[PDB]
Ligand binder design. Structure first.
Ligand code: DGD
Ligand code: DGD
Ligand code: DGD
Ligand code: CLA
Ligand code: CLA
Ligand code: CLA
Ligand code: CLA
Ligand code: CLA
Ligand code: BCR
Ligand code: BCR
Ligand code: OEY
Ligand code: CL
Ligand code: CL
Ligand code: FE2
Lengths: 334, 37, 137, 33, 244, 442, 27, 97, 30
């Protein structure tokens, strides 16, 4: 009945339409700050000197951008990894030119999304659930940390953090490939397997359950009305699902235990995506994709090109053109 | 290089750092033998 | 194509005398060049002064000529600037500066020849790629 | 910007026509129960 | 007594010129014979004024103030040159070297960014005749060069440049090119600027002087893309003199 | 109740077999320290910088002052051998206690002696075990102080004259300095505790931590947890493991940044230059090259309008130009002679650059921590030739990976510990589903 | 000469298991 | 009326000889004895009224005068082009390999 | 006009969110 205790009970109430929780106490303000700044900058921020060379890139809609080309532009390379809050600028005009909004948005977002993951733990405890859904979300969350925080740290600049834009994203993945040969990096190859594989097993499992739905309806109505929310019996025939799938391949490559099947569904993309997040996080320290440039030579010592060499010619074209005005010296060491 | 009087064990030493790995492999031979109990 | 004696045959001195390396010497030189030199001279370029490379035409025009075993073995002993006017042992690996460039400490005289040999043969095999840079990768 | 003038009508109709259709089917569904 | 890097770093004092005691109202006398150098000339701007464009005839727009957006990156320093005595006692300073340029961008009211190459490159500044002493009424007046803000290798966002780059609008392959010649052909501008330096403090003991400056010069013309603005720069300066 | 694949969870309430697990695993750790060191020495070649050679353990020994003299010149390899042997030998003793306690000793300890036995829920016994280990840890940190002050010193990359071993006679005791580090921003130009740049502060902080750890060790032996701590924590073995997994994760992230940025307790002489270091070294290299040819590097305007060689930082310091503008916070013993109080001094650059600085810059620029997974050095477009990945890249990436999974491990075990404590870790009770007794949201 | 000492180390481990089984031990 | 001055300079002797008034210093490596030492002198003492002015650079050893004489036929002078000499571009023009 | 269009659509999505969450068909048991 005490004031603090009644507050505590409202924060942790399982009766709020949206759960707040103690993690929510930090998430809500920070996601609101990041969302509100993001929306306003995307529409109306003036151009930002991403690469510190007094060459501002225009990222917002009112400055001639569309949904596809617009972005919140990363802060100035002149700032590197220095903290640049609003109150460190002589004025908002300076803060805008140097890319201040990017920093505000990413720090609040990373914080708020971290608390999002904790909030998933918390409500699961309040509801008497097992606790590990948050572990599934750590795979996307790690990915966001890698491109917004870890890769700048290792490279020394939020200017090389991933842009908050559709085409900005593409600019980031093109430069990454030329500086790190990410395609030839095995952790990225595991991400692709995690993502291709994840979409495959999504399709498989959805098609396998859907194929074995038990007839509960007529042809004039959605089969979906054959399931009623909360019903105790299962709504498909898993043995029929197993009997089709086991024969499509062979018996023992098919799951007859739904718990093992669903845990496999969880782990495959989560682990692939951990690796591909690890990939970005370790290429942040410049431990790059396999390099087989000129690895095949003939008896005389002529180079016999492979597909790795052709890839290298593409990487080279990306390297020499990216940030065409920023380099004064012959090696792009960061 | 090693001091000369140990010259002898040079190729044993090229192998020693991998032995900790063998203990993980070894835990799977043990479980294969006991039936993954 | 293969590593024939014609290719392994390089000027010894500026008189015009020639010397024919063995396949052994050539692969010796390549190994040694990777050990002592490639950190700056991978592919016949010079990462720390890209204006000066190891193409044979460049060496030929150096003072004293360096397009021959003698000039190159001498360079590894007492390196000079391209015009010959100053000795640069203080800032270039050399036998004369092996106290400060410790990798040169175990280079023997025939190692120098293999290295100089590698440098003269490689343009014959690789052509423009040697000293050409990334354009030719 | 020198943008396609028909973009606007195209976008508007692309939004309005399929949306109006869904609304029509929802409201008449509700007038049944 | 003075400060170390670790005392200054990150404070913003690295962008500030050295100042003279408010007691330093001396005079530095000039051996008509002996020669002299400036071992260090420092110029710290404090104000950036841009000339508006008045649209009509006899209105002539004004110098309006601007907001700096490029931070504490504005000062010229470590400059040096000959300090000569002319026949008539005028002194002439001839710039030789130094950090004699800084790119700056100021923001006009309404959003327009105005970049410029704040510079004293190749400065030659003279005094009146009959000097014989540098005093708290000595004025230098002179002129300097203002090279193009971008130099020749600079590539615009479509890859077009002067010493490098595309010579056309490659995204518009069959467009009529005469509309686009101003944007396609880059030009290297070289213009003059003017500067007054007003000595207001002198340490007769040490040869250090300090005061105020006003320079006028052109802003960036983006390699001929557009017309420049006129810029007036006010700030403070400091210099040390040595018998060469 | 645990399957074979979670079989080590069967040791949770078997204190004797679990002791053997820990001690045998501690032997594995000491084994690898020993074996790896001897492998590195077997392969070590003294004329070659360590960082051309794949070494991660020899550099840690050299850094304590053994085997090296001025400049990191390796003078004596025997200390390296000794360290390997004693570690390798000591792991047999730990191996021996390990397999003994794990297979033959008493499964559970608490019946043998009431001293070594424990129950996870015995909050008093647990803080006592904690305290003993705190005192041990405190002792260890003072061992470092003893080596630095009484048994030969430490390698000091900053020592005047190119670096050398030096005895630390005046450790920083001022807590404004020691704990000042703990309150610096972790962002650029500040760098939290990673910026520690002199051995006085390193030795001094290890005095503090040793004393703090001993003090706290005695505290926890002598006390029991207060009620506010009783009510905020989960008291169980899994819960304690989860607490430590989080701490290990945090520490691994710190070490990653340490080895990537700090060139004091990871001297560049041994580990290679940092990313920032190498990037600054390239600007130094061409500044030197161009100035010798007659360029006036102070007045040379680059393509963008910014200085080609020198510009200002956002607070005005004179700094290296080009992309490396981003690395102006870098400080290294080869560079600081050129720095005045406005940053890089143009008159020192013109007049006072020494050949050893030209050499160090050329070397560090050509040994930047960039490399492929198969150890081809340089940018990713470089051809094969140079077999090199920097020890710092190997050390940063490995420990980022490890730190990340330990964080996952912390979430895994912390969540499980909570649910096991409340009794729903095995699933929802069908007859008592919490949500079915809650009001509907809407 | 990397079979005069290695092969024996890799065999060491599986041999402990072939001797504890075939002599029924607490595995 | 809008001309690229660099392209236009490629239509002059600048396009065929080393231009003592404009060419980057790296071009003095294509003829022996000229780099780095004479190259450094030529560049710093530019600009030159005609090719033969190089021999009037003070401090020349008679050996240096001989090399310059040997190479005068590989030099030219055109008007200084601002675009090629500003920004220290004669010492470093942005081109490596 | 293109800016108005993009923001308008985004604004509609955000309002749709509001109704999807707070004016959903409420799930009902068995
Ligand atoms: C428990 C609850 C925790 C909650 C607390 C949250 C508040 C803290 C937030 C931390 C923000 C980290 C940003 C780091 C940015 C950066 O500049 O960080 C690097 C800094 C080091 O800073 C660098 O420090 C350097 C120190 O070197 C200096 O001094 C050296 C001395 O040898 C050298 O001389 C060197 O040349 C010289 O520059 C300089 O200051 C650089 O300018 C500066 O960038 O690291 C450090 O502070 C060390 C620690 C950084 C940790 C970052 C790891 C992030 C882990 C994220 C994992 C996400 C996983 C998601 C899971 C799903
Ligand atoms: C769904 C599945 C999707 C696929 C994902 C699976 C991930 C791995 C996929 C590829 C693995 C096989 C690729 C074959 C690579 C090859 O044979 O690799 C060969 C390379 C060595 O390459 C050689 O490397 C040499 C390096 O040269 C350098 O070094 C030489 C001296 O060695 C010379 O000095 C030379 O001049 C100098 O340039 C040359 O490049 C040779 O040409 C080149 O063949 O091996 C090395 O790097 C060995 C060390 C790296 C091994 C790392 C293995 C990958 C680790 C993934 C871990 C996943 C685990 C997850 C657990 C869950
Ligand atoms: C089916 C079989 C079972 C295999 C399951 C897969 C488990 C993964 C292992 C892959 C299998 C291949 C391993 C053996 C080949 C290999 O790797 O062989 C490579 C070497 C042995 O090869 C030597 O590798 C060397 C690599 O260069 C190193 O040595 C050079 C020597 O001058 C330089 O010092 C250089 O800088 C330095 O990096 C050279 O290339 C030698 O020529 C070559 O002989 O083995 C190593 O090092 C051994 C090190 C193993 C420990 C790995 C520790 C690394 C942890 C880093 C984690 C980073 C995470 C990011 C991932 C991305
Ligand atoms: C201090 C570290 C530590 C400790 C003591 C424990 C202890 C425990 N964990 Mg935890 N765990 C940790 C770290 C730790 N964990 C980390 C970092 C993670 C995240 C990856 C986890 C994730 C985790 C999960 C998901 C689960 C546990 C479980 C458990 C329990 C049973 C584990 C078992 O039998 O494994 C048996 C060991 C194996 C099956 C072998 C795994 C081998 C790995 C995956 C391969 C690594 C290979 C290597 C990278 C390269 C190979 C090279 C090649 C040559 C062979 C036990 C209480 C279980 C539990 O909750 O029970 C209470 C459980 O389900 N752990
Ligand atoms: C954990 C820290 C760590 C770090 C940073 C290193 C780093 C290094 N080691 Mg050591 N090493 C380690 C652990 C570590 N090792 C362990 C545990 C062993 C015993 C197996 C060894 C045994 C060893 C030998 C025998 C040799 C090295 C060598 C090397 C170098 C080259 C590595 C390479 O090419 O790998 C290639 C990369 C891989 C194989 C990637 C593994 C990917 C895994 C499976 C994914 C991880 C999933 C999760 C954990 C590098 C300096 C070599 C060297 O240069 O020696 C001087 C060398 O010959 N190391
Ligand atoms: C660091 C690795 C590590 C360690 C130290 C342990 C330790 C332990 N495990 Mg776990 N375990 C591990 C990894 C590890 N495990 C992994 C990777 C898995 C997944 C495959 C498991 C799966 C697992 C299961 C499923 C079970 C255990 C159990 C046990 C305990 C009893 C084992 C027993 O009686 O076997 C007896 C085994 C033998 C008699 C075979 C010989 C084994 C010896 C020790 C080989 C060592 C050889 C070495 C070279 C000798 C050097 C000698 C010299 C030092 C003197 C023991 C404390 C059991 C348990 O908790 O029981 C209650 C149990 O049921 N473990
Ligand atoms: C932290 C590790 C640890 C812990 C907690 C224990 C705990 C225990 N052991 Mg185990 N043991 C260990 C390590 C450990 N041991 C190791 C490494 C070995 C192999 C050398 C053994 C071998 C062993 C045997 C053979 C037996 C035990 C027994 C016991 C029990 C009785 C101990 C006693 O009264 O001894 C009396 C205590 C002493 C004589 C004091 C010893 C002081 C040591 C030698 C010095 C410690 C200093 C420092 C910590 C070492 C580091 C030095 C190094 C870094 C250079 C007890 C539960 C007994 C048991 O359970 O029987 C059923 C038993 O028979 N232990
Ligand atoms: C291995 C280390 C270790 C561990 C695991 C513990 C564990 C514990 N300590 Mg002991 N403690 C230790 C070392 C350790 N202690 C040492 C060395 C000392 C001497 C200084 C103490 C002194 C001490 C006292 C005086 C007390 C405890 C208490 C406790 C209990 C409550 C802990 C708690 O709530 O912390 C959680 C901490 C908080 C809720 C507040 C901490 C806020 C910090 C500042 C956050 C900073 C995190 C940030 C991201 C990292 C940057 C650091 C920043 C300073 C720059 C718990 C059993 C309490 C108890 O019950 O004792 C009987 C108690 O009152 N500890
Ligand atoms: C050595 C050295 C040094 C020093 C150091 C030091 C002195 C440190 C300290 C450190 C410390 C001092 C640390 C601390 C830490 C802490 C932490 C890390 C915390 C944590 C916390 C937590 C985790 C909590 C949580 C919670 C909450 C919040 C609520 C309720 C629940 C709980 C309890 C869970 C120097 C740098 C000088 C130099 C070098 C060396
Ligand atoms: C230092 C030293 C030493 C020591 C050593 C040791 C300590 C040993 C150990 C060793 C060991 C410890 C061994 C182990 C081995 C193992 C292995 C070789 C394993 C194998 C495995 C496998 C191959 C597997 C398979 C499988 C199974 C079984 C099931 C599932 C599936 C799979 C496929 C995974 C000595 C004495 C020499 C002396 C000198 C020095
Ligand atoms: O890849 Mn290429 O490297 Ca990482 O910096 Mn150097 O150039 Mn620039 O700033 Mn963004 O980008
Ligand atoms: Cl780009
Ligand atoms: Cl650069
Ligand atoms: Fe399902």
């Amino acid at each position: 009945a005490n004031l603090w205790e009644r507050f505590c009970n409202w924060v942790t109430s399982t009766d709020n339409r949206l759960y707040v929780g103690w993690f929510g106490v930090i998430m809500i303000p920070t996601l609101l700050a990041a969302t509100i700044c993001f929306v306003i900058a995307f529409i109306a921020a003036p151009p930002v000197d991403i690469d510190g060379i007094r060459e501002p890139v225009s990222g917002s809609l009112l400055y001639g951008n569309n949904i596809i080309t617009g972005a919140v532009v990363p802060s100035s390379n002149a700032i590197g990894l220095h903290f640049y809050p609003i109150w460190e600028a002589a004025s908002l005009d300076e803060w805008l030119y140097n890319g201040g909004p990017y920093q505000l948005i990413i720090f609040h977002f990373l914080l708020g999304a971290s608390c999002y993951m904790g909030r998933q733990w918390e409500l699961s405890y309040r509801l008497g659930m097992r606790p590990w859904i948050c572990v599934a979300y750590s795979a996307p969350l790690a990915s966001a940390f890698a491109v917004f925080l870890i890769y700048p740290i290792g490279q020394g600049s939020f200017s090389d953090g991933m842009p908050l834009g559709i085409s900005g994203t593409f600019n980031f993945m093109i430069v990454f490939q030329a500086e790190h040969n990410i395609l030839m990096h095995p952790f990225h190859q595991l991400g692709v397997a995690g993502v291709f594989g994840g979409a495959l097993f999504c399709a498989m499992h959805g098609s396998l359950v859907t194929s074995s739905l038990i007839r509960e309806t007529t042809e004039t109505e959605s089969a979906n009305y054959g399931y009623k929310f909360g019903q105790e019996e299962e709504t498909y025939n898993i043995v029929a699902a197993h009997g089709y799938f086991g024969r499509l391949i062979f018996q023992y490559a098919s799951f007859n235990n739904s718990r093992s099947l669903h845990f496999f569904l969880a782990a495959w993309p989560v682990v692939g995506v951990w690796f591909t997040a690890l990939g970005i996080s370790t290429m942040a320290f410049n431990l790059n994709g396999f390099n087989f440039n000129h690895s095949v030579i003939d008896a005389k010592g002529n180079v016999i090109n492979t597909w790795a060499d052709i890839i290298n010619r593409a990487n080279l074209g990306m390297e020499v053109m990216h940030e065409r005005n920023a380099h004064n010296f012959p090696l792009d060491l960061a | 290089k090693l001091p000369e009087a140990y010259a002898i064990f040079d190729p044993l030493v090229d192998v020693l750092p991998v032995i900790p790995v063998l203990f993980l492999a070894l835990a799977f031979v043990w479980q294969a033998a006991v039936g993954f109990r | 194509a293969e590593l024939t004696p014609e290719v392994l045959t390089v000027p010894l001195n500026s008189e015009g005398k020639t010397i024919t390396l063995t396949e052994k010497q050539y692969l010796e030189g390549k190994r040694l060049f990777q050990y002592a030199c490639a950190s700056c001279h991978v592919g016949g370029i010079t990462k720390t002064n890209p204006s000066l490379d190891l193409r044979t035409e460049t060496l030929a025009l150096a003072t004293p000529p360096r397009d021959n075993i003698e000039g190159l073995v001498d360079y590894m002993k007492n390196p000079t600037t391209y015009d010959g006017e100053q000795e640069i042992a203080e800032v270039h690996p050399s036998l004369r500066s092996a106290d400060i460039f410790p990798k040169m400490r175990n280079l023997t005289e025939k190692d120098l020849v293999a290295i100089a040999g590698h440098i003269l043969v490689e343009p014959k095999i690789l052509g423009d790629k040697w000293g050409g840079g990334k354009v030719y990768y | 910007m020198e943008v396609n003038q028909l973009g606007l009508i195209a976008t508007a109709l692309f939004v309005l026509v399929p949306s109006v259709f869904l609304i029509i089917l929802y409201v008449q569904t509700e007038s049944q129960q | 007594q003075t400060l170390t890097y670790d005392d200054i770093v990150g404070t913003g004092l690295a962008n500030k010129c050295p100042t003279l005691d408010d007691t330093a109202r001396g005079a530095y006398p000039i051996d008509s014979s002996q020669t002299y150098r400036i071992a260090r000339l420092c110029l710290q701007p404090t104000t950036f004024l841009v000339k508006e464009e008045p649209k009509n005839k006899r209105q002539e727009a004004e110098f309006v103030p601007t907001k700096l957006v490029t931070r504490e990156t504005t000062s010229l320093d470590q400059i040096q040159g000959e300090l000569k005595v002319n026949s008539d006692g005028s002194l002439t300073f001839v710039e030789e070297d130094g950090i004699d340029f800084q790119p700056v961008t100021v923001q006009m009211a309404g959003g327009e960014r105005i970049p410029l190459l704040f510079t004293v490159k190749n400065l030659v500044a003279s005094t009146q005749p009959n000097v014989t002493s540098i005093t708290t009424s000595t004025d230098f007046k002179g002129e300097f060069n203002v090279p193009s803000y971008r130099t020749a290798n600079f590539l615009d966002p479509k890859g077009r440049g002067l010493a490098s780059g595309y010579d056309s609008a490659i995204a518009l392959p069959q467009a009529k090119e005469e509309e686009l010649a101003r944007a396609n052909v880059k030009r290297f501008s070289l213009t003059k600027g003017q500067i007054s330096l007003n000595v207001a403090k002198v340490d007769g003991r040490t040869g250090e002087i300090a005061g105020t400056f006003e320079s006028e010069q052109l802003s960036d013309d983006d390699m001929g893309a557009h017309e420049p603005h006129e810029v007036k720069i006010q700030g403070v300066f400091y210099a040390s003199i040595e018998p060469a | 109740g645990f399957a074979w694949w979670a079989g080590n969870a069967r040791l949770i309430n078997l204190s004797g077999k679990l002791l053997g697990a820990h001690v045998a695993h501690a032997g594995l750790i000491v084994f690898w320290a020993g074996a790896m060191t001897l492998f590195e020495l077997a392969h070590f070649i003294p004329e070659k910088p360590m960082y051309e050679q794949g070494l991660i353990l020899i550099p840690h020994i050299a850094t304590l002052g053994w085997g090296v003299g001025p400049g990191g010149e390796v003078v004596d390899t025997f200390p390296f051998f000794v360290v390997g042997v004693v570690h390798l030998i000591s792991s047999a003793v730990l191996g021996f206690g390990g397999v003994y306690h794990a297979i033959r000793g008493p499964e559970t300890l608490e019946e043998y002696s009431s001293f070594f036995g424990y129950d996870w829920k015995d909050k008093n016994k647990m803080t006592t075990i904690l305290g003993f280990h705190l005192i041990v840890l405190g002792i260890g940190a003072l061992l470092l102080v003893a080596k630095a002050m009484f048994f030969g010193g430490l390698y000091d990359t900053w020592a005047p004259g190119g670096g050398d071993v030096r005895v630390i006679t005046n450790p920083t005791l001022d807590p404004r300095v020691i704990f000042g580090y703990l309150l610096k921003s972790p962002f650029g130009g500040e760098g939290w505790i990673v910026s520690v740049n002199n051995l006085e502060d390193v030795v001094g902080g290890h005095i503090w931590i040793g004393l703090i750890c001993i003090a706290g060790g005695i505290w926890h032996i002598l006390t029991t947890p207060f009620g506010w701590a009783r009510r905020a924590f989960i008291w169980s073995g899994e819960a304690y493991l989860s607490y430590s997994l989080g701490a290990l994760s945090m520490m691994g992230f710190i070490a990653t940044c340490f080895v990537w940025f700090n060139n004091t307790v990871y001297p560049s002489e041994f580990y290679g230059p940092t990313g920032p270091e190498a990037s600054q070294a390239q600007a130094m290299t061409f500044l030197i090259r161009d100035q010798k040819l007659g360029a006036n590097v102070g007045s040379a305007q680059g393509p963008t309008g910014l200085g080609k060689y020198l510009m200002r930082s956002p607070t005005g310091e004179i700094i290296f130009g080009g992309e490396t503008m981003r690395f102006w916070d870098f400080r290294g013993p080869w560079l600081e002679p050129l720095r005045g109080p406005n940053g890089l001094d143009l008159n020192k650059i013109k007049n006072d650059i020494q050949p050893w600085q030209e050499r160090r810059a050329a070397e560090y620029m050509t040994h930047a921590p960039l490399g492929s997974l198969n150890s081809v050095g340089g940018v990713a477009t470089e051809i094969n030739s140079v077999n090199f990945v920097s020890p710092r890249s190997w050390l940063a990436t490995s420990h980022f990976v490890l730190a990340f999974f330990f964080l996952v491990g912390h979430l895994w075990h912390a969540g499980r510990a909570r649910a096991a404590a409340a009794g729903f870790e095995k699933g929802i009770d069908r007859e008592s589903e919490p949500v079915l007794s809650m009001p509907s949201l809407d | 000469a990397q079979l005069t000492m290695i092969a024996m180390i890799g065999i060491a481990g599986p041999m402990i298991i072939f001797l504890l089984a075939v002599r029924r031990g607490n595995l | 009326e809008l001309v690229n001055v660099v392209d236009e300079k490629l239509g002059t002797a600048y396009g065929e000889k080393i231009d003592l008034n404009n060419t980057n210093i790296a071009a003095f490596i294509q003829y022996r004895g000229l780099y780095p030492t004479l190259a450094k002198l030529i560049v710093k003492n530019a600009p030159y009224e005609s090719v033969e002015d190089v021999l009037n650079i003070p401090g020349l050893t008679e050996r240096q005068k001989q090399i310059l004489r040997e190479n005068l036929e590989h030099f030219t002078v055109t008007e200084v082009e601002t675009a090629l000499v500003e920004g220290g571009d004669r010492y470093n023009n942005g081109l490596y390999k | 006009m293109e800016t108005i269009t993009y923001v308008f659509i985004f604004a509609c999505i955000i309002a749709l969110f509001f109704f999807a969450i707070f004016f959903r068909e409420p799930p009902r048991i068995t």
